[PDB]
């Protein structure tokens, strides 16, 4: 219900305009700072902040001597209303005599990142904000539907613009996006990625802020919406966001027993029908 802040200010540009500064920070979307801690800071003998003003999510501080080395001064804040969405806040620091000499810095929640996640590559900078998908092990668990678990997902409620069966070779990381290098065995459905075929490599990106993982060596089935970014080689790149069907294809080792062979039959019926027919219904 409470969170502790920390404000560090310093200057390495003493050659330019110098003097004092006004540190204007914006608290989180619902928090408001404690007046008691700032009053204790100001009423010190060797006071570091000479003036302050707190109102809602706005805190104003006046630093009369900006040093060259780090000098952090902290306080506390309480919570009034819940944070409706994950977002980074801002903190500006103006120069007293020339307010045009400012410095604005974005900061994030105690566990999130300071900038909105975005898939950026050359000209295209497709957004990657929302939810991240789950690893639905439908085959492993016991469930049954009348061409509804996968055919309905591919042709009734969501419309999947691409679908492949791929093999995971290598795992990597790139900024905040976890990267999976996969090879396409057979193409199930495509709209824009016409050049995709067998023995072709593709990249799958998932935000590194959740638990999704693709083990190496295993074979998966990927289906979802087509992206807008391109790889370094000029080939389309796909983002594993929500409303995307990812499912490991069984290797028949844990399917030969009678119970799961019916589910495997439903699987093969699905893949064959979807590959050969163009999303009926």
């Amino acid at each position: 219900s409470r969170v502790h802040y920390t404000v560090c200010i310093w200057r390495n540009g003493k050659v330019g305009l110098s003097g004092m500064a006004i540190a204007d920070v914006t608290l989180l979307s619902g928090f408001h700072a404690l007046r008691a801690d700032l009053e204790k800071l100001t009423s010190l003998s060797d006071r570091y902040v000479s003036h302050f003003e707190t109102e809602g999510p706005h805190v104003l501080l006046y630093f009369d001597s900006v040093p060259t080395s780090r000098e952090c001064v902290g306080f506390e804040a309480v919570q009034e209303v819940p944070v409706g969405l994950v977002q980074p806040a801002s903190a500006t620091l103006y120069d007293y005599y020339n307010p045009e000499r400012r410095c604005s810095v974005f900061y994030g929640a105690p566990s999130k990142s300071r900038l909105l996640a975005t898939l950026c590559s050359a000209e295209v900078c497709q957004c990657a904000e929302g939810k991240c998908p789950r690893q639905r092990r439908a085959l492993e668990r016991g469930l049954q539907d009348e061409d509804g678990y996968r055919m309905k997902f591919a042709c009734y409620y969501p419309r999947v613009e691409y679908g492949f069966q791929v093999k995971v070779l290598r795992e990597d990381s790139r900024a905040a996006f976890r990267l999976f290098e996969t090879k396409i065995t057979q193409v199930l459905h495509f709209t824009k990625d016409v050049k995709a075929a067998a023995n072709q490599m593709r990249n799958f990106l998932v935000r590194a802020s959740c638990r999704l993982r693709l083990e190496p060596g295993k074979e998966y089935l990927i289906m979802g919406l087509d992206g807008a970014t391109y790889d370094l080689e000029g080939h389309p790149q796909y983002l594993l966001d929500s409303n995307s069907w990812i499912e490991e294809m069984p290797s028949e080792r844990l399917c030969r027993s009678t119970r799961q062979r019916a589910a495997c039959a439903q699987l093969n019926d699905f893949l064959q029908e979807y590959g050969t027919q163009g999303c009926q219904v």
Epitope: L34, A36, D37, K40, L41, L44, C72, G74, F75, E76
Partner: nanobody
């Protein structure tokens, strides 16, 4: 701005108290011979925030008194090999949870010994 601190077989309990003239976020540190001192826990000024070392998670607790302005630290379920000199230190700029040793006007501490 001066700090005064005052206050056993293994598996028992103890309650150290550190008193300071000024009311601030005085934290606790522990120093053992032959090795650099390491923190144990910290508390903010008002007292509604506490952090503890990973080795003592959910074991030691800190409270504060609003009348005499002192910090209390209870160590029920005392572990045999936690013997060290206990210090209470603080700074005047309210850097809550500042793990590294950047606390000014350090205290004198007390020697506490533990027997298995």
């Amino acid at each position: 701005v001066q700090l005064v601190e005052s206050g056993v077989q293994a598996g028992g309990s103890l309650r150290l108290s550190c008193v300071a003239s000024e009311r601030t976020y005085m934290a606790w540190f522990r120093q053992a011979p032959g090795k650099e001192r390491e923190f144990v826990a910290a508390i903010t000024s008002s007292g509604m925030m506490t952090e503890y070392a990973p080795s003592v998670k959910g074991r030691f607790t800190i409270s504060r008194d609003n009348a005499k302005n002192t910090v209390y630290l209870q160590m029920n379920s005392l572990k045999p090999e936690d013997t060290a000199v206990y210090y209470c230190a603080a700074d005047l700029r309210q850097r809550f949870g500042e793990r590294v040793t950047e606390y000014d006007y350090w205290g004198q501490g007390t020697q506490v010994t533990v027997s298995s």
